[PDB]
Amino acid sequence: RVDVMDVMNRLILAMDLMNRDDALRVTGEVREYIDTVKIGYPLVLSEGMDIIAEFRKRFGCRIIADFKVADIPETNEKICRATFKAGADAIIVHGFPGADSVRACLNVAEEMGREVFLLTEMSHPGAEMFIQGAADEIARMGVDLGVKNYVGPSTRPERLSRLREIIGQDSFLISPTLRFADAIIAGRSIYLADNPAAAAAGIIESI
Amino acid sequence: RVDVMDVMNRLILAMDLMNRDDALRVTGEVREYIDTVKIGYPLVLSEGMDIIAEFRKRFGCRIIADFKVADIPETNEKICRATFKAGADAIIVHGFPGADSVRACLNVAEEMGREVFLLTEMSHPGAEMFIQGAADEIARMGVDLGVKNYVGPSTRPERLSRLREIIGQDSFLISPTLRFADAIIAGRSIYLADNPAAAAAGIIESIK
């Protein structure tokens, strides 16, 4: 789809290491394979938001800020603005806090020419308590708000088909499979590999 | 209660300004009245996590990191560790992601001698869609995790009574009322006031 992002090789690196030296070393080594890197709070709180601009300038990669934004609208707006000002191309936001909290993010994204990804579901054990039961309604809420980018369940293929049914064939879907998701996310498989470059190469082959 | 934190004058400052100069100026001016400051991502993402230690070293205040932690357990652990390493006394974490995600935070807080606050509910309009219906069960989940500190609804006093019922009379409850909550949180009423010091003084007088 022309109107959603192109992720090189359909493979996103989840750069979840917390020290800047290690994080930079891995990302540069895989830049030939991956052009899209997802960073979260462990790295940015440890090293500073300046690390976002550093990844973009050193590797020319797209950055998705996996900040799971989950506050009231006014605070969500400020979080998004700070994150986009730091150079993030996109931000991941929770749907559980409701439509006006998501819309606040959409507003800033439109102002600044950036992207919002709605997190529809999570796959860790405790996700059963509240998140799983809300997932379809959260996805529908996204569709109704014109959300174009979604983060889906890590496990359960049949969950991806259901999400794809709700969001349509045009929207962009990433999952931590490629029959339904546009790109997959790899973390440890790569950054804990002795040869991250080789690891990335291998995943790409099977893709 | 001896085992939960003492908040000076039962009044917490929500320091939601995003520039370090303005934030420091307001907090220092009210340190006589307030010893507990709540900081969120707008400030720390804009100015750096080092600002937490700066607040503590300049004002000797307790810092609560309102980070609404809402990730998987392993990531929650790392967020809490980074935040406590930066000097936060406490961190606010969402309950919606479930019990293991909360326990991960409790584990690090136990290791490091810090505190976890469970956010049981929110009061902004969209909170009706999913949060309001989960609030009592989230509170019960907290109690069944030995959670001692809770952040409750900003609005609706009768919600505070329900929460207090679930969590018991011993647990620590803060709210943005004092018949149920141990402390209240003031933000704009103070940091946007002509003189914050006077604003704080005023609210305090209303508190007996």
From Swiss-Prot, chain B:
<dbReference type="InterPro" id="IPR018089">
    <property type="entry name" value="OMPdecase_AS"/>
</dbReference>
<feature type="active site" description="Proton donor">
    <location>
        <position position="68"/>
    </location>
</feature>
<dbReference type="GO" id="GO:0044205">
    <property type="term" value="P:'de novo' UMP biosynthetic process"/>
</dbReference>
<dbReference type="InterPro" id="IPR013785">
    <property type="entry name" value="Aldolase_TIM"/>
</dbReference>
<comment type="subunit">
    <text>Homodimer.</text>
</comment>
<keyword id="KW-0210">Decarboxylase</keyword>
<dbReference type="InterPro" id="IPR011060">
    <property type="entry name" value="RibuloseP-bd_barrel"/>
</dbReference>
<keyword id="KW-0665">Pyrimidine biosynthesis</keyword>
<feature type="binding site">
    <location>
        <position position="123"/>
    </location>
    <ligand>
        <name>substrate</name>
    </ligand>
</feature>
<dbReference type="InterPro" id="IPR001754">
    <property type="entry name" value="OMPdeCOase_dom"/>
</dbReference>
<keyword id="KW-0456">Lyase</keyword>
<dbReference type="GO" id="GO:0006207">
    <property type="term" value="P:'de novo' pyrimidine nucleobase biosynthetic process"/>
</dbReference>
<protein>
    <recommendedName>
        <fullName>Orotidine 5'-phosphate decarboxylase</fullName>
        <ecNumber>4.1.1.23</ecNumber>
    </recommendedName>
</protein>
<dbReference type="InterPro" id="IPR047595">
    <property type="entry name" value="OMPdecase_arc"/>
</dbReference>
<dbReference type="Pfam" id="PF00215">
    <property type="entry name" value="OMPdecase"/>
</dbReference>
<comment type="pathway">
    <text>Pyrimidine metabolism; UMP biosynthesis via de novo pathway; UMP from orotate: step 2/2.</text>
</comment>
<feature type="binding site">
    <location>
        <position position="187"/>
    </location>
    <ligand>
        <name>substrate</name>
    </ligand>
</feature>
<comment type="similarity">
    <text>Belongs to the OMP decarboxylase family. Type 1 subfamily.</text>
</comment>
<feature type="binding site">
    <location>
        <position position="188"/>
    </location>
    <ligand>
        <name>substrate</name>
    </ligand>
</feature>
<dbReference type="GO" id="GO:0004590">
    <property type="term" value="F:orotidine-5'-phosphate decarboxylase activity"/>
</dbReference>
<dbReference type="GO" id="GO:0005829">
    <property type="term" value="C:cytosol"/>
</dbReference>
<feature type="binding site">
    <location>
        <begin position="66"/>
        <end position="75"/>
    </location>
    <ligand>
        <name>substrate</name>
    </ligand>
</feature>
<comment type="function">
    <text>Catalyzes the decarboxylation of orotidine 5'-monophosphate (OMP) to uridine 5'-monophosphate (UMP).</text>
</comment>
<dbReference type="InterPro" id="IPR014732">
    <property type="entry name" value="OMPdecase"/>
</dbReference>
<feature type="binding site">
    <location>
        <position position="38"/>
    </location>
    <ligand>
        <name>substrate</name>
    </ligand>
</feature>
<feature type="binding site">
    <location>
        <position position="16"/>
    </location>
    <ligand>
        <name>substrate</name>
    </ligand>
</feature>
